[PDB]
Subunit: 265 residues, 4 copies
């Protein structure tokens, strides 16, 4: 018996096989889940990547800025999972910020049009996906998004930090809506994992500073350490939330960061 | 000797004489500050309102969505305060959310275009104003914005809650920039005050506000009295919180410290 | 099959079958754990209660104020689980405050001797148990304590609120120590559950404010919780504790998981 | 003219002229306050130190573990300020932890007797002082205690961290009581300041790692603070305490003001 045996779970956000979503999906399939996957923009590349998962899973296109994609999403999921079936889980593992909003670009020089796009994709879309998909979720279901602790400012993360703060607030409102369906909504505040988006943050000249700051903020603080090349602990944590084993947690944030955020130094 | 004697302070956000900014401005003038005021959209109304302040102050137009207003702001402040003078303080007391983003409108039905406008005015603009004005601020200066505690979701406040969360995060980054100028940046998380914006968001509203605030506050909370809020903002503009930045001071009667 | 298949877990704090520890233990056995149980003071009563668990488990005496009990604990656990075996999990589900520290007794009238006893049992003992047991824990293990959100003051909970604040701080230090053994330490901040200790806060189920206690609990929890909250159902709490004892939260330590229906995320 | 013109303020915790309480008292007198001072144990030393304040102030003995001192405190303050006068302000700037509770001494080896003494003096006493003095405080008054941010664990601070967590919780309950008198209760979470407790007590408990201390403090504070942090300058902290004693934070209670250069708002 797998942790997610018989659950139907939608997973967004696979772009490469380092993607946090790829590992969430891998672990969920290892634990008996039937997945629907969504991908943005490079669908043929993404299909090649999702072929490396342990099991087959249909891949549906979703650009969270596209109103038509969102309006048709539930119908397209239903068609993939079979009429009369519903989702037990939804994973939002999606983010974006234009280059002006991150890295060494001065914080004040990001135009609002760029910041707005970032907040749309990174924060608002958590609400939009929940809106689209709650109508096809079973009671006892679980919506999970990915967070990066924005409680304190930090170098480089800049306007994405602002977007994460927004996302945390959105998650608490999504929980209010989701509760009417017997559905939980939570975020996983992950420690740093080496992904495509991670390399986009400085995106350059200061790659060395990024690694140094990450080692100082996370592995050095974490009482159990932190390995940025191992997404499994994060994937497992997301699977815990998708499971029946955190049935009283909603509107909330679970930290999968080796305990770093609990330690000052 | 007033608390803000000899300080030059820009105050945004006066629309009526209930405005939190109106009271911030009144108290700051009572404490010896020389003000510059900024107003949005209803300049003739705002001029009538600012005539009720204890002292005269120049009023400059500022729509925080207008790039040209922001690009000319510092020059227009400098011309009002006299060349070679700088600001000691900046008050951001500004917000907006379209009707779709608040009240009884379902949370999921606010389009992003509306939420975005709200975030632009209510959060991003804190950074915009700091960008425009830090180059004309003295060391030891203070930037203050108004917050409403968004740590927990609540009825009605909806997407404005999201905007306030964004604002809190923006404030922490503004503090990093402002520190290079020897300038502090902080928010005041105020309890509820009867203002124009409040009526934009009424018996259930007042009951919820009384439950969240006065009933929790160990010293009580009076929604018709802006003075405690204005004083708190003046404390932050003063020299008396010189080691506080990137931070949030709660002027809410202690409500947020009490569960029930 | 089970979430805790093959794990050896110590569970403290069973006094009745409403005890949060009793449900933690029940769920853990349903999920394939082998338990060792510890009990305080009323060992014969507790033995009768633990007979109602799904499976047999040895019961060992532990008064967390007793230095000798703590010094012999690991040896007595080892003898119960078999030499060469170690624990995978430890559950601290223990608390105490004298009556002067709770309820309608004025906050300022609790003498420090009483508050101190409360803090000793309710907070310091989390460190004591970890000290005693980490030497017999496997890497990958998990220590879990029970919390009640003390971030804001509230009526009645009074000095126990202070003890919980202390416990949260202790948990973060225990995490630092436990990390050296590859062991996690976390608390579960539970919503309210009707237990013996709950009734002791107002001086009994009959206590003068029992009515106000239930009203405040309904206002603080079920009314705020987006998924509701049932004070008569410990299962969601027990499951949450079992999640932490499992391998499924492997990157969480020094931390607090809220099993409160999401109440703490909502203002009203 | 002064921020605290005409206020009567009690200040505890002066032991040397580096004491945060000494600077709180200095600044308060510069701002027009009439003080009553309390000191512990070394009254002759403390009298010499308080002579270096800008104005004379009566000094009363107070050992916060001594029940008789607490029971007589109000009467002895009243006699110093004149019958029928009340205090506007009370400053708690008092702490203690035995060396076993700090530094390089292992966290698990601190006996509870030592921790308890620490918590008594550093946390419970905030309640005891408020109990003694609220009956002689005017409406609009202010009680202020000193905090060091214990939200996250850290090296060395150990069980004092636990005590500060307890103090924060105590402060929220003191606020509930104080509100009935129209009185505010708040803490100032200060950045690190070179004092006797810092250097001798915390420094001493670090033993052969005493040299680490400045490096750890610079990493936690000045490096994070957007306006920097100077450990040799207590004035920003003193001013912050005076802000809270003033009428200029009239809607803040049960709360914590951070006078740490903004360090706690920045991750790195
Ligand atoms: N990697 C880390 O260190 C880390 C830590 C904490 C949180 N997170 C968050 O985890 C999530 C996944 O990021 P990742 O690190 O795995 O990155 P990744 O680059 O592997 O994935 C980011 C995903 O966002 C998708 N996306 C962007 N714009 C989109 C749009 N308009 N519509 C739909 N999808 C869109 C991309 O298509 C991609 O699949 C993000 O929310 C990220 O902020 C990452
Ligand atoms: N009233 C309360 O209960 C309360 C409590 C906490 C925080 N706040 C915050 O205090 C601030 C002031 O609100 P208020 O209650 O005094 O209401 P108010 O209606 O009196 O003022 C809000 C101000 O926002 C200005 N504004 C809107 N769009 C703008 C734009 N494009 N450019 C510039 N200014 C713009 C309006 O002109 C008005 O002056 C806001 O940040 C609000 O969220 C209010
Ligand atoms: N019931 C709730 O609403 C609730 C909610 C959140 C947290 N908690 C916490 O849950 C834990 C268990 O509480 P409960 O509600 O199950 O209570 P309960 O009354 O069933 O059991 C409390 C236990 O504490 C044990 N204990 C007391 N003094 C002891 C000592 N000296 N040495 C060892 N054990 C000792 C008792 O034997 C008893 O088994 C406590 O930490 C409590 O604070 C309870
Ligand atoms: N120095 C720092 O870096 C720092 C930072 C934040 C908070 N604090 C806090 O500030 C306060 C003042 O400490 P400090 O650093 O000025 O040190 P300090 O040594 O100058 O003062 C500590 C005071 O505690 C008193 N005290 C101890 N036991 C007492 C008792 N039984 N009765 C009464 N008074 C007693 C001492 O007599 C002394 O005056 C404490 O609460 C401390 O935890 C210090
Ligand atoms: N998807 C996405 C995404 C979009 C914009 C920026 C980051 C995004 O994904 C992340 C990728 C990696 C991280 C972890 N992280 C933070 C940093 C910054 C530099 C050191 C501190 C902050 N580096 N890596 C966090 C993320 O949210
Ligand atoms: N300026 C502005 C503004 C724009 C959109 C929404 C609110 C705005 O100002 C406020 C006006 C009033 C309040 C306090 N408040 C919140 C509410 C909601 C009603 C139920 C509780 C929350 N009612 N009054 C907070 C505010 O930020
Ligand atoms: N074990 C134990 C224990 C010892 C002293 C006090 C409480 C104890 O266990 C709890 C029992 C019940 C609760 C939950 N709780 C809170 C309260 C109220 C706070 C609002 C009114 C009383 N009533 N029940 C929390 C607990 O820690
Ligand atoms: N009074 C008092 C007191 C008693 C025992 C221990 C400390 C006391 O006062 C302090 C003295 C100093 C600080 C700041 N501090 C912390 C440290 C630790 C060394 C590594 C960082 C934590 N060093 N200086 C905080 C305090 O409460």
């Amino acid at each position: 018996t797998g942790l997610l045996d018989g659950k139907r779970i939608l997973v967004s956000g696979i772009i490469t096989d380092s993607s946090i979503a790829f590992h969430i999906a891998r672990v969920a399939q290892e634990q008996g889940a039937q997945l629907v996957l969504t991908g943005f923009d490079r669908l043929r590349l993404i299909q090649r990547i999702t072929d490396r998962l342990p099991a087959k899973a249909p891949l549906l296109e979703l650009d969270v800025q596209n109103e038509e994609h969102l309006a048709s999403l539930a119908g397209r999921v239903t068609e993939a999972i079979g009429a009369g079936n519903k989702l037990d889980g939804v994973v939002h593992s999606i983010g974006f910020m234009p280059q002006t909003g991150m890295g060494i670009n001065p914080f004040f020089d990001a135009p609002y049009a760029d910041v707005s796009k970032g907040i749309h994709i990174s924060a608002y879309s958590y609400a939009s996906m929940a809106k689209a998909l709650l109508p096809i979720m079973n009671p006892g279901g679980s919506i999970v998004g990915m967070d990066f602790d924005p409680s304190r400012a930090m170098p480089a993360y800049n306007w994405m930090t602002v977007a994460k703060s927004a996302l945390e607030s959105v998650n608490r409102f999504v929980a209010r809506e989701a509760g009417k369906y017997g559905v939980r909504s939570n975020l996983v505040a992950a420690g740093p994992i080496r992904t495509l988006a991670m390399s986009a943050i400085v995106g350059g000249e200061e790659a060395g500073a990024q690694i140094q700051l990450l080692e100082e903020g996370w592995d050095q603080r974490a009482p159990i350490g932190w390995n940025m090349k191992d997404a499994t602990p994060v994937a497992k944590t997301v699977c815990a939330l998708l499971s029946d084993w955190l049935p009283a947690t909603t509107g909330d944030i679970i930290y999968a960061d080796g305990g770093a955020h609990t330690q000052l130094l």
